[PDB]
Design a binder for this molecule. Structure first.
Ligand code: HEC
Ligand code: HEC
Ligand code: HEC
Ligand code: HEC
Ligand code: HEC
Ligand code: HEC
Ligand code: HEC
Ligand code: HEC
Ligand code: HEC
Ligand code: HEC
Ligand code: HEC
Ligand code: HEC
Ligand code: HEC
Ligand code: HEC
Ligand SMILES: O=S([O-])[O-]
Ligand SMILES: O=S([O-])[O-]
Ligand SMILES: O=S([O-])[O-]
Ligand SMILES: O=S([O-])[O-]
Ligand SMILES: O=S([O-])[O-]
Ligand SMILES: O=S([O-])[O-]
Ligand SMILES: O=S([O-])[O-]
Ligand SMILES: [Ca+2]
Ligand SMILES: [Ca+2]
Lengths: 519, 519, 105, 102
């Protein structure tokens, strides 16, 4: 049984917490719910921490008073097929291996599944830790509640005695680095300086041994990623997002200055030894577009190379933790602005970008976004009850499971079948264009070895490599993006037609050059 | 947004609250969640209340931190057919009008429905307030959430300008009195002295104008009826139950002194002006048998008559608020102990008891009770979740809706259909004996006018009236009790056969006496 | 495990059984499936039973070779409501008690 | 939940079967290129010995009907071996072809 502490004692030294806690809807929620600070209070001074208080990061710290939201969050959607590789003829990218050759995603790239599994799935995917981590056995793959209780309750480490990234099975990679973890957990929120910069007060940073960092982390998608635990108000905690919206002044809606002002973000900074250490972004409104954009964006969270000179850009560089905050048609400029690319294609040698799940940047400017609809309206709607206290579902999943609330309340002109049909028209059309984009990319790729062995000039090969960058960008955005065009069907169509055009241009260039060598 | 108050200051005067609050699982729950005491604190001394603080009795006061339990409670079971009269051939008591003639239940006695409706249903039933209260319209009968928010949000009063009990429609009765409300609400918990005795500090008592009392009451089945709001620990608040178990020393399980000691009750008394005023009964364990026995018992909550001399026993008498706390075979002795009966039969003239829903007293000594099973195991089971934090369902309903949790976890040998079949075997057999008991009671009753008109002696009519008491008791227990025998099938059988035996004895006596008058 | 008996010896006395068994579709079904007659055969004459043989009356004696029929027979129809008294308003004979008064039913 | 556990294994194993086929096909398609480039029989025979293993450690799992369920760790180890063998052969043939061109 918890015993309350005198918060006034804390407030003497913690004035930002005072200002947040006393005003919001957690004004009556005692510190003891989330902190054990007895020895801290005995030893702290106004500028020195003394003994470090314990802070609970487990989701159960919130489930005691918010069981409905917690239970809705932890539910496992068994229809979200697990461990399903995307580089197969029946999934999102049938020609992914040929197109991505040279990148670590070639080792494994599965479809997403329920949020409860994000941290464990990050740990066990074949591309991340060389196969070092596994579930304790194959039964544990079902255990969402166990994963939420903590990753290390359901996983095993092949070698607890070493901390290096290395392959434990042959067809694995070691792509994981500490930046990844910021989109899986915020257990490290008090141990990681803003952006992962080096900092005397930070236990972990971009340059940490990721295997050691991994062992310290337990919980997926902490509840406080979207809700300040002190004010209970809406926020983001993801450093990369704050950096794009606030530091770089791009705004919460880069295409809409007015909506950016109405639905903006305020950066709040916390210090260690009176030096800036960490930050949060308080939202003007409970805006799920921005909450979900903590993770559902295109980013750098990895080393890469410079476009200018080809030199390595390591984890120590700020560019290794970067939100581009740019739509598909602005992305190339955004990558040029930081002078960055991800990998060289194994076959063509082209410098290429690697795109990841750009849902937020795709949603901008779409019909639903322009009409003020947000991610939560379709993916975590209010529950409808004949007799009950309404709450917001936290089971972030496809609207197909809750069409009445997610779609039909707005679209009164439609039955469930009609709304599903409309979704499928868009996904079927977009997927057809993704498959055609891959056909043309693959045709271009396969000409590179033919051209090389025919003695085609480097000048021509480099021209084709520049086209490959665009052909790739304007295709991969859409295999990376999870809606198969639904979030912005006209943009997907325009982009995928651009991909095909670029590949066709490269195919013609290489075919002509090969034929001239033969003649 | 609530602002916390200094609970330590309250504790300078409220030492019993201190001892309960600081120790239990609400030690961190600030008083401002349920009390507005600003002016009270300014004006009170340890010996004078000063300004009366406000105390919240609404269930929303608990729903803020316990939404899952609140929503499970407020759910309406549409399959529990509403306003369904029991005196019909397709319900529980086909010959009820003949058998109950002379009692207010003849005006209306419907089947129970969901707990959300208990207070509104009490207010609108034809036997209670002469038809004074109605739902605002016939649509409002569906609105469980509205009823929980408050009775007067969904009901109308035919005459707000008068406070007398009278008939507003011809075929209604005015049986309601202040004792009834104790089993519908505890909004009056700080305004009602223990047992409803007269008390300087009580706004309301057994002798109040019930229409005035009604207007002051809003919420059904307050959450704190089973849970102390200060300690969060298990309790009862119903005066009649505390009186039977503690004051009269009967124990929580009158037939089991060991279980009574292990699962006992501690009476806690609160004073006004340094005189005892109200009481609660803290339970040793979270024993739903005793929680549910606050209402699901046979009781007096009405005026009646003395068995000794036939004189009136009015609402002013302590006997007007009484829990007999006796099984069917001990009831007659229990009623003799307090020298009480309810009504005289309109046709036979017999002094008769009126029985109401004796579920708790029926459950004693049954196979499930003897095996440590309690009401909640079958009617409020723990929820089963593939992934989730377990909580206790508060939707207190038939186990038919949740057979996996209510029955089949214990009865692994059975399918759902087999368990339902076992329930129905008992209910069918018991109902058949109820119907035969009514057949014989009706045969006996119909002989009374024949006997009177034939000049049969008063001595013979009185012997038959004595048998009518028993014939009635041993039948009505089982139309009153809601399980149709399931809670104690052997007791139902033994009792119903006793009813038939008694009726047969009276029929023989009367037929012989009539025949002798004709000869 | 059952061991077959010499049915021809039984038939030396049991001519009606012979005429029925040898002709029908149980001609290959040995007597040991349903009778234990060891001591009977040792002690009987055509005119004296001797020791009484055991005859199986359990339905399992047939279920061994006719499981489909046995299982279809033993199935419980849960929809056939059990212990449901007919002298009730919702069953077959609402006024049965008045009409049958004097009878055990 | 039990169906989900089956599908996790089948989906993972099938993904590795598809990748094993991708790499086998890539190797196979280099044989005519190598032949017509004049790559030596010595190199072609080295690649043929690798083909035996690349094939065995793939085809076992298209032949076997459980899509890995009957022995998920063995399927994983075998299919990773298939991919490794194909990759070794692809590198051998690519290098040899490139040396013929130079
Ligand atoms: C002044 C003497 C203090 C009192 C009283 C309390 N805290 Fe404190 N705390 C203090 C300092 C100087 C620091 C270092 C950061 C800074 O602001 O300079 C802290 C740190 C914390 C933290 C962060 C711990 C971490 O892991 O980084 C927490 C969660 C914290 N303090 C909580 C806290 C509570 C709940 C208190 C009342 C019981 C409290 N502190 C008292 C200075 C002082
Ligand atoms: C009980 C002691 C609580 C704990 C532990 C947590 N919260 Fe809470 N929360 C609590 C109350 C009484 C309220 C106010 C309810 C009301 O509607 O008045 C809240 C409110 C929230 C909200 C809504 C805030 C708003 O709309 O402005 C959120 C988003 C919230 N709480 C989240 C939350 C999280 C993430 C917690 C764990 C870190 C958590 N709460 C703990 C009671 C309690
Ligand atoms: C936030 C900007 C992210 C960073 C940094 C990383 N990941 Fe991620 N990941 C993110 C989202 C929003 C999703 C779901 C949508 C989707 O397209 O899958 C994911 C998914 C994964 C998965 C599961 C799917 C899969 O590819 O197998 C894994 C295994 C995963 N992510 C691993 C991973 C690694 C190793 C990272 C650093 C190199 C990494 N993620 C960063 C959001 C973000
Ligand atoms: C009892 C006779 C079993 C039957 C029938 C099935 N399973 Fe099983 N399974 C059983 C045991 C004793 C174990 C090992 C348990 C342990 O923790 O030591 C298992 C294992 C599994 C696993 C994990 C396999 C792994 O390689 O780690 C899975 C995914 C599994 N079982 C699923 C499963 C399914 C889907 C079944 C029906 C087709 C099934 N099992 C049958 C016991 C028994
Ligand atoms: C961002 C991805 C979120 C995470 C992680 C959590 N919640 Fe949430 N919550 C989210 C949104 C968009 C909303 C609705 C805001 C609106 O007003 O439209 C909510 C709401 C809450 C509330 C308020 C009551 C309600 O509407 O249900 C509570 C109490 C709350 N959320 C709690 C909660 C808990 C306990 C979480 C961890 C299990 C949790 N939230 C995560 C967005 C996000
Ligand atoms: C309704 C107008 C939507 C809004 C607003 C957002 N999304 Fe969406 N999303 C939508 C549909 C119809 C679909 C396809 C669902 C299907 O079953 O076909 C999606 C898909 C996703 C996915 C993949 C879900 C899955 O396949 O299981 C993700 C990860 C997703 N959407 C995220 C997302 C985010 C972060 C949004 C705000 C920026 C967002 N969506 C808005 C419908 C709608
Ligand atoms: C002594 C100076 C007191 C302080 C400080 C507080 N209260 Fe009090 N309270 C006091 C008295 C003498 C009485 C009359 C009852 C009695 O014990 O003799 C009360 C009564 C209450 C009640 C009941 C009101 C009712 O309707 O009957 C409540 C709910 C109550 N008090 C709450 C309360 C709270 C929450 C306080 C701190 C903010 C508090 N009281 C201070 C004496 C004193
Ligand atoms: C949030 C500010 C709360 C309000 C308002 C109420 N309760 Fe509560 N309750 C709260 C917490 C944080 C806990 C402890 C949770 C844990 O398991 O640690 C509780 C506990 C209860 C319990 C369980 C008590 C026990 O098992 O000993 C009950 C029965 C309970 N609460 C009931 C309850 C009622 C009826 C309320 C309205 C009068 C109520 N609670 C308010 C948080 C909060
Ligand atoms: C607790 C000991 C009770 C007292 C005192 C009163 N009632 Fe009641 N009532 C109680 C229970 C447990 C039930 C449900 C079980 C059942 O057999 O119905 C009820 C039900 C009602 C109903 C609905 C059913 C009906 O008869 O129409 C009404 C209208 C009702 N009760 C009214 C009522 C009146 C008028 C009372 C005082 C004269 C009264 N109740 C007292 C528990 C208790
Ligand atoms: C629109 C053309 C309607 C159709 C078709 C049905 N109902 Fe209706 N109903 C309607 C109105 C405008 C009103 C009065 C509303 C008010 O608040 O003034 C009603 C009323 C009812 C009621 C209340 C009856 C009463 O006497 O108080 C009930 C129970 C009701 N309606 C139910 C109902 C059902 C079951 C219908 C289909 C058979 C139905 N209504 C049709 C509007 C219309
Ligand atoms: C008596 C008829 C009850 C009323 C009225 C309410 N609850 Fe209850 N609650 C009840 C029982 C028998 C139990 C289980 C005790 C056990 O341990 O077996 C509970 C439990 C709770 C809890 C604890 C968490 C859980 O088990 O779900 C809470 C927080 C709780 N109940 C809250 C609650 C609220 C908010 C109510 C009003 C809507 C409420 N309870 C009414 C019995 C009774
Ligand atoms: C399981 C072993 C049970 C225990 C313990 C209790 N009851 Fe029960 N009850 C049980 C059954 C199978 C039935 C019949 C349900 C059906 O649908 O046929 C009942 C019935 C009730 C009812 C009437 C419910 C209705 O008809 O909707 C009430 C009011 C009821 N039971 C209350 C009750 C109480 C108060 C108990 C503890 C003293 C109790 N029951 C124990 C199964 C079980
Ligand atoms: C003549 C020497 C006999 C031989 C060889 C067998 N049985 Fe017999 N059996 C015999 C007699 C005289 C009687 C009495 C009935 C009669 O026909 O007069 C019987 C009786 C039986 C019975 C019936 C026993 C009963 O409970 O009534 C059976 C089932 C029976 N016999 C079976 C039987 C079998 C299976 C034999 C071969 C192993 C057999 N008998 C030999 C005379 C003679
Ligand atoms: C196996 C050793 C058997 C035992 C023991 C019983 N019966 Fe049988 N029966 C058996 C066979 C091989 C056949 C013939 C199947 C065919 O179609 O050729 C039968 C046949 C029957 C029939 C059908 C007879 C007809 O259509 O003429 C019936 C009705 C029958 N058997 C019933 C039966 C009963 C009731 C048994 C227990 C006393 C029994 N059989 C035993 C094989 C075996
Ligand atoms: O209040 S915080 O900034 O210590
Ligand atoms: O690797 S994550 O970004 O899907
Ligand atoms: O603590 S109470 O008894 O005033
Ligand atoms: O303790 S009281 O008497 O002030
Ligand atoms: O009148 S109540 O007791 O059913
Ligand atoms: O064959 S019988 O009749 O003994
Ligand atoms: O045939 S008999 O009589 O032995
Ligand atoms: Ca990227
Ligand atoms: Ca009574």
């Amino acid at each position: 049984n918890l015993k309350p502490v005198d918060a006034m004692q804390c407030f003497d030294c913690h004035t930002q917490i005072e200002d947040m806690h006393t005003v919001g809807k957690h004004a009556t929620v005692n510190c003891v719910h989330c902190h054990d600070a007895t020895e801290h209070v005995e030893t702290a001074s106004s500028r020195r921490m003394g003994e470090r208080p314990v802070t609970r990061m487990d989701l159960e710290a919130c489930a005691t008073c918010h069981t409905a939201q917690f239970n809705s969050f932890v539910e496992v959607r068994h229809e979200s097929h697990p461990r399903l590789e995307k580089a197969t003829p029946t999934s999102r990218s049938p020609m992914f291996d040929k197109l991505i050759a040279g990148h670590g995603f070639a080792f494994e790239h599965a479809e997403p599944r329920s949020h409860a599994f994000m941290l464990v799935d990050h740990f066990v995917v074949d591309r991340a830790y060389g196969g070092r981590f596994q579930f304790k056995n194959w039964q544990k793959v079902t255990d969402g509640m166990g994963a939420v209780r903590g990753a290390w309750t359901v996983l095993t480490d092949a070698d607890p005695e070493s901390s290096d990234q290395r392959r434990f099975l042959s067809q694995t990679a070691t792509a994981a680095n500490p930046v990844c973890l910021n989109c899986k957990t915020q257990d490290h929120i008090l141990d990681w300086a803003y952006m992962g910069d080096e900092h005397e007060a930070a236990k972990w940073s971009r340059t940490s041994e990721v295997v050691e960092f991994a062992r310290d982390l337990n919980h997926p998608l902490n509840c406080f990623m979207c809700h300040d635990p002190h004010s209970a108000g809406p926020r983001v905690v993801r450093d990369g997002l704050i950096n794009a919206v606030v530091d770089r002044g791009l705004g919460t809606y880069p295409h809409d200055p007015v909506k950016s002002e109405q639905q903006g973000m305020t950066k709040v900074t916390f210090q260690r030894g009176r030096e800036d250490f960490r930050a949060i972004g308080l939202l003007d409104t409970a805006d799920s577009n921005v909450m979900c954009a903590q993770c559902h964006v295109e980013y750098n969270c990895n080393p890469g190379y410079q476009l200018s000179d080809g030199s390595r850009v390591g984890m120590d560089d700020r560019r290794a933790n970067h939100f581009f905050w740019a739509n598909v048609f602005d992305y190339k400029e955004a990558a040029q602005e930081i002078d960055f690319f991800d990998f060289r294609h194994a076959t063509t040698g082209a410098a290429l970008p690697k795109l990841q799940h750009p849902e937020a940047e795709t949603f901008w400017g779409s019909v639903h976004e322009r009409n003020g609809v947000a991610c939560a309206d379709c993916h975590m709607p209010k529950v409808q009850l004949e007799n009950g206290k309404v709450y917001t579902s936290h089971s972030q999943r496809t609207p197909r499971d809750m069409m009445g609330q997610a779609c039909l309340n707005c679209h009164a002109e439609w039955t469930e079948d009609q709304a599903l049909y409309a979704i499928d028209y868009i996904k079927n059309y977009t997927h057809g264009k993704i498959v055609k984009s891959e056909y043309w990319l693959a045709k271009m790729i396969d000409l590179f070895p033919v051209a090389k062995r025919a003695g085609v000039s480097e000048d021509v090969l480099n021209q084709a490599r520049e086209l490959h960058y665009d052909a790739h960008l304007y295709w991969e955005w859409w295999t990376a993006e999870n809606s198969v065009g639904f979030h912005n069907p006209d943009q997907a169509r325009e982009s995928l037609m651009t991909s095909i055009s670029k590949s066709k241009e490269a195919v013609s260039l290489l075919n002509d050059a090969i034929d001239a060598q033969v003649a």
